[PDB]
């Protein structure tokens, strides 16, 4: 019921007393959440009055298709997103098949929120934090079976030459336990941070069974804490992958890396290098780099790359229960389980 296969343990809105609602538009989602804060007497209840299961049936393909055709006109528009602020009764936002959104989900100071089967893409407002999914000061969040996409490209003359599009899954603050699973993330320059700054360290996050394709960096950009990445398929990484910083620890197991530049590294700070424990990935030694097109580059400040493909530290005993399939099975099967319209199907060895 509360098993996500990672550090997050939540059933979201699928609990006792849950109220099911259908949202046909972004504004409905907003109105529905607002109504869920009132008690039988019409007075607001801190954290929400009752649990919710919102089924989003909206479709914004027209907005998405128009944006895909004019990539550079997106960054300067107003950002669009539904905010889930201080809602702790339990909430699940699940898209209907055929559903789509050109707006993001921004979670702040909440807990026990699950967002599933949502196809989100080409969001406007990259220069004003137009994230697809943001988890801020929010423990027990599960982002599962979603398709997050844009174009892995940077337009000219954008603020900081970094704002053509914002991130897919940014995690920051006290979001102590989070699970990011079965997502199909493609065409994204900045996938997601795990800590917004050098001081924003900590958290225990699990990234499992995600399919990354044509992404530039931040898988994630980790600042301290623990990150467990297993059964992910990493292909066409154009910049860097898992960047473990501020003495963070990562357990990188049974993943498949292919056509990736700097898949596992610790760079951009020049100090306080993170560590990684590598085991069961398709790459087992430097000899495999050529086999899978793994390239390494240096940085202008002191850095550490896993070009020796050896463990550089340790990792505490993994709390939860999980059963990873082989890296080969991920490569062969994952694409059919990750994303939307897969009916939240999970990959087990039985299917390998
Ligand atoms: Ca952001």
Swiss-Prot record:
| Cofactor (UniProt) | Ca(2+)
Catalyses: Eliminative cleavage of (1->4)-alpha-D-galacturonan to give oligosaccharides with 4-deoxy-alpha-D-galact-4-enuronosyl groups at their non-reducing ends
The disulfides recorded in the entry are 72-155, 329-352
| One GO molecular-function entry | pectate lyase activity
Predominant location: secreted
The free-text cofactor remark is: Binds 1 Ca(2+) ion per subunit.
What is this enzyme's class at the first EC digit?
lyase
Read off the SMART domains from this record: Amb_all
Instruction: Give me the residues that bind Ca(2+), please.
Output: 129, 131, 166, 170
The protein's UniProt keywords, in alphabetical order, are: Calcium, Disulfide bond, Lyase, Metal-binding, Secreted, Signal, Virulence
User: Alphabetically, which GO biological process terms does the record hold?
Assistant: pectin catabolic process
The keyword Ribonucleoprotein is assigned to this record: no
Q: What is a single Pfam family found in this protein's UniProt entry?
A: Pectate_lyase_4
Residue numbers annotated as active site: 218
User: Which pathway does this polypeptide act in?
Assistant: Glycan metabolism; pectin degradation; 2-dehydro-3-deoxy-D-gluconate from pectin: step 2/5
Can you cite an annotated GO cellular component?
extracellular region
Record's subcellular location: Secreted
Q: Which InterPro entries match?
A: Pec_lyase, Pectin_lyas_fold, Pectin_lyase_fold/virulence, PEL
Return the EC number. Answer: 4.2.2.2
Q: Which family does it belong to?
A: Belongs to the polysaccharide lyase 1 family. PLADES subfamily.
Q: What does this protein do?
A: Involved in maceration and soft-rotting of plant tissue.
Under PANTHER family, the record lists: PECTATE LYASE 18-RELATED, PECTATE LYASE 21-RELATED
What is the protein's given name?
Pectate lyase C
Which lineage?
Bacteria, Pseudomonadati, Pseudomonadota, Gammaproteobacteria, Enterobacterales
Protein encoded by which gene: pelC
